[PDB]
Write an enzyme that holds these catalytic residues in place. Structure first.
Site, short mmCIF file in Angstrom:
data_model
loop_
_atom_site.label_atom_id
_atom_site.label_comp_id
_atom_site.label_asym_id
_atom_site.label_seq_id
_atom_site.Cartn_x
_atom_site.Cartn_y
_atom_site.Cartn_z
N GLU A 493 0.80 -1.17 0.10
CA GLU A 493 -0.05 0.12 0.04
C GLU A 493 0.85 1.19 0.01
OE1 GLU A 493 -3.30 -0.37 3.01
OE2 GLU A 493 -2.60 -2.43 3.09
N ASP A 498 -4.46 6.60 4.38
CA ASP A 498 -5.19 6.43 5.26
C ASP A 498 -6.48 5.69 4.79
OD1 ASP A 498 -8.18 7.63 6.41
OD2 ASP A 498 -7.07 7.98 7.87
N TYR A 521 -6.77 11.52 19.93
CA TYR A 521 -6.08 10.86 20.98
C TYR A 521 -4.68 11.76 21.07
CZ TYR A 521 -3.28 6.79 22.23
OH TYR A 521 -2.71 5.70 23.28
N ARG A 524 -3.22 13.99 18.64
CA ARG A 524 -3.44 13.62 17.53
C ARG A 524 -4.81 13.76 16.92
NH1 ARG A 524 -3.94 7.68 17.65
NH2 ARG A 524 -1.70 7.89 18.48
N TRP A 570 -16.28 5.79 10.17
CA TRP A 570 -15.08 6.81 10.42
C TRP A 570 -14.94 7.92 9.43
CZ3 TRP A 570 -10.06 3.16 11.21
CH2 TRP A 570 -9.98 2.56 12.30
N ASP A 608 -11.13 -5.38 6.11
CA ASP A 608 -10.92 -5.06 7.26
C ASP A 608 -11.93 -3.97 7.90
OD1 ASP A 608 -8.82 -6.62 7.32
OD2 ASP A 608 -7.35 -4.92 6.92
N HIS A 704 4.85 -3.26 16.90
CA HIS A 704 4.86 -1.73 17.48
C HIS A 704 6.18 -1.93 18.28
CE1 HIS A 704 0.99 -0.86 16.32
NE2 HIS A 704 0.61 -2.08 16.46
N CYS A 736 0.18 -6.85 13.18
CA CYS A 736 -0.49 -5.74 12.43
C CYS A 736 0.36 -5.41 11.22
CB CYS A 736 -0.44 -4.56 13.53
SG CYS A 736 -1.46 -3.23 12.99
#
Length: 768
Positions: A493, A498, A521, A524, A570, A608, A704, A736
């Site tokens: 990708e 996004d 967040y 963010r 979203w 997803d 992560h 992930c």
């Protein structure tokens, strides 16, 4: 009739707060400078609200990072690992929210989770067994109330209430305390805080108890009586209290309401649940005030004034005008700052929108209209015309989409054959070994990938030049996957930034803003797409890159899509039709895309839905069941059009499916990946209990972390997974996507990953 705003967005017209916070974290401005910007923003936003004519203006709604975090500090509920660093209050605050590095040490942040069903995140109160509470020096609500007062603004302080504060909390590591049992230790501190606010001049306070929209544990339900008895018992020494609820109805908790009989008022969300109005009216005390939340705090549409006034007049008729307040349904932190910053929207959609600056004007206009509609007749008329314009627009009356939906059948939601039948075709087609290896989707986002994408979207490089760059990026990904010997490939990708915006840009029915940021967040923020009309797909959205990837791929290549529930949730959804209608339109558009990928050489398609769980109605019952039905049906409608030999994959970004596994199973996905490597393998027990019949890849690699796990660590994780899952159903993949990693880390980890898989292939090989 008075108007009320429950909270105002904090970031500022140009995300001033984000810029200042981050400049402070990077040592570019002092603490004084940062605090001065915070002060400047509070003052500016109070002025916006006063200038708009709002009667009841909130204070303590502002936060540098999170308001629940503000309460942690306010009640001195800070764990020792933060207080021992001897930081300034501000740095200590930030430490809990994002982390800190003093004296060598590396202190992680407190857990942040989503605020109810919103896209906002709060910091969970994290409490010790021996937890006690006390009021911080210079308590923020008092400080900020006096600040507003000094600038000529009388405001109404907003607190998160004691029950919700504990109900939203957790035991710290090393402790096992059930937070609600700390109630008796916490309530006296609220009482003291409330006395200080009263003494400072606050006539009333808004106390949010949002957990009232939940199905409540009996321990939590039992907490409201003593908490609010204590507040009432303080008499005139504390302010009048309006208890606030939002994002759901409270009619299932009428047995809790007697706890609030000594409170002055109750706020309910009549945008999400207008139907709860009259049952709630019957439950109000003789002198209690209803704060009627009729201006949407969660979306960006201009209020339907006529519809809101009908609701308000029902309340005024039952209670008298002095017992009704016109309010935002929730805090406006969930909405963008102002529509006026948008200069490139299609001319016809402006008159349908209201962002926060426009909404605080709306509650004032409504409050005036309740008793003196002649004073604002021109505004009422203009509003009616705007609503009519929206109803009559070509955007909301697409005949082709209407006809396509009308012809959808139940059978179109189902795969041609059940998995038992399907899987036979799939194993051949894909030529998969035992323990097949794959990755989740994205590959490292490098500086050059971002730069090139930026140049193209800004028009500095041609489409042809960018397309060639993307080809070379995909070739690189495939070459690297060749060297890794993965079994199912992805294209990485490089062309996407996004997972909802990418699709919104390639669908009819969406518009995009340039400045409509919402805090998500900490500092963010997100800039959600807006659904303005009926949705359809005018052209292939992802086929070009996937087609190219498959043309050079020696292994099956994953198609990569975002599901209809997430494209919907979203975004800012429409409010003129039901969300199930919008989701079906998305599902049909995505069905075409899936079928198009399959036609172009792609026979593994990952769809997803990271927003599926987020959208769950907040209490059990017919509404929650309704949501799950159309959310699941939409995913199925999007994915059911494929051949039996095509695999449908879906990635889940959480490790637990409490009261939710049935919906996951209903998706009928061939293969599920789940984030799992940092979780105890024992959580895989749910698959055993539910006798899950299809394939599963719990992540083996924590992506992560930049650390490269060893071959032995990969083997041990695989062994631990095989304690719960059958060999034939196990996929081997990371937790992930790999966008945030660098290629040296990725090559090292994925190399060890494949080698571990190959080891188990040998181990589980047939004996002689």
């Amino acid at each position: 009739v008075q108007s009320s705003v429950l909270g105002f967005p904090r970031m500022g017209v140009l995300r001033d707060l984000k810029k200042a916070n981050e400049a402070y974290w990077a040592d570019k401005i002092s603490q004084e400078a940062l605090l001065a910007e915070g002060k400047r923003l509070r003052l500016a936003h109070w002025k916006i609200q006063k200038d708009a004519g709002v009667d009841i203006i909130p204070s303590n709604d502002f936060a540098h990072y999170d308001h629940v975090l503000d309460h942690i500090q306010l009640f001195n509920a800070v764990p020792e690992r933060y207080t021992s660093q001897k930081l300034s209050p501000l740095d200590e605050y930030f430490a809990m929210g994002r982390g800190h590095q003093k004296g060598g040490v590396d202190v992680p942040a407190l857990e942040m989770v989503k605020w109810f069903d919103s896209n906002y995140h709060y910091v969970k109160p994290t409490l010790q067994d021996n937890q006690t509470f006390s009021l911080a020096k210079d308590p923020k609500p008092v400080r900020e109330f006096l600040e507003a007062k000094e600038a000529g603004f009388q405001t109404r302080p907003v607190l998160v209430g004691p029950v919700s504060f504990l109900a939203l909390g957790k035991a710290d590591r090393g402790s096992s305390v059930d937070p609600i049992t700390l109630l008796d230790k916490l309530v006296p501190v609220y009482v003291e805080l409330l006395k200080q606010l009263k003494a400072a001049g606050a006539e009333s306070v808004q106390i949010d108890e949002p957990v009232l929209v939940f199905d409540l544990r009996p321990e939590v339900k039992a907490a409201f009586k003593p908490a609010y008895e204590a507040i009432a018992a303080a008499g005139d020494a504390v302010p009048k209290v309006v208890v606030a609820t939002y994002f759901g109805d409270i009619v299932h908790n009428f047995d809790v309401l007697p706890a609030f009989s000594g409170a002055a008022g109750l706020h309910v969300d009549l945008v999400r649940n207008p139907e709860q109005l009259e049952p709630v009216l019957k439950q109000l005390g003789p002198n209690q005030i209803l704060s009627a939340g009729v201006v949407d705090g969660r979306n960006i549409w201009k209020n339907d004034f006529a519809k809101s006034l009908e609701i308000l007049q029902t309340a005024v008729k039952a209670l008298g005008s002095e017992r009704v307040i016109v309010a935002t349904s929730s805090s406006l932190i969930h909405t963008p700052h102002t529509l006026a910053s948008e200069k490139k929207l299609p001319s016809d959609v402006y008159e349908w929108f209201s962002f926060a600056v426009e909404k605080v004007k709306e509650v004032a206009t409504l409050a005036k209209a309740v008793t003196e509609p002649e004073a604002v007749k021109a505004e009422l008329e203009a509003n009616a015309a705007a609503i009519k314009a929206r109803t009559d627009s070509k955007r909301t009356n697409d005949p082709a989409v209407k006809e396509r939906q009308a012809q959808v059948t139940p059978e179109q939601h189902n795969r041609k054959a059940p998995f038992n039948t399907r899987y036979a075709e799939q194993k051949k087609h894909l030529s998969l070994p035992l323990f097949p290896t794959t990755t989740i989707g994205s590959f490292p986002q490098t500086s050059e990938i971002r730069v090139q994408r930026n140049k193209f979207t800004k028009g500095e490089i041609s489409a042809e030049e960018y397309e060639r760059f993307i080809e070379k990026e995909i070739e690189l990904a495939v070459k690297i996957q060749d060297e890794l010997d993965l079994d199912v490939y992805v294209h990485g990708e490089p062309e996407r930034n996004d997972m909802v915006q990418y699709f919104g840009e390639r669908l009819n029915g969406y518009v995009f803003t340039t400045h409509a940021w919402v805090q998500s967040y900490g500092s963010r923020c997100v800039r959600p797409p807006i659904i303005v009309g009926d949705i359809s797909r005018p052209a292939p959205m992802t086929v070009k890159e996937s087609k190219y990837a498959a043309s050079i791929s020696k292994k099956p290549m994953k198609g990569m899509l975002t599901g209809p529930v997430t494209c919907l949730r979203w975004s800012f959804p429409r409010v003129d039709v039901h969300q199930s209608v919008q989701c079906q339109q998305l599902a049909l558009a995505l069905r075409d895309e899936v079928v198009d990928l399959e036609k172009n050489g792609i026979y593994v398609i990952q769809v997803d839905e990271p927003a599926l769980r987020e959208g769950l109605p907040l209490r059990k019952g017919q509404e929650r069941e309704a949501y799950l039905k159309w959310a699941v049906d939409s995913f199925k409608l999007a994915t059911a059009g494929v051949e039996n030999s095509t695999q449908i994959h879906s990635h889940f970004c959480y490790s637990e499916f409490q009261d939710f596994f049935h919906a996951i199973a209903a998706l009928d996905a061939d293969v599920l990946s789940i984030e799992n490597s940092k979780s105890d393998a024992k959580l895989l027990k749910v698959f055993i209990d539910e006798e899950y019949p299809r394939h599963i890849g719990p992540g083996v690699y924590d992506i992560h972390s930049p650390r490269v796990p060893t071959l032995e660590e990969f083997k041990q994780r695989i062994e631990e997974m095989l304690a719960y899952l059958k060999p034939e159903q196990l996929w081997i993949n990371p937790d992930c996507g790999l966008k945030t990693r660098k290629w040296d880390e990725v090559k090292g980890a994925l190399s060890h990953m494949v080698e571990a898989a190959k080891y188990f292939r040998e181990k589980y090989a047939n004996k002689a």
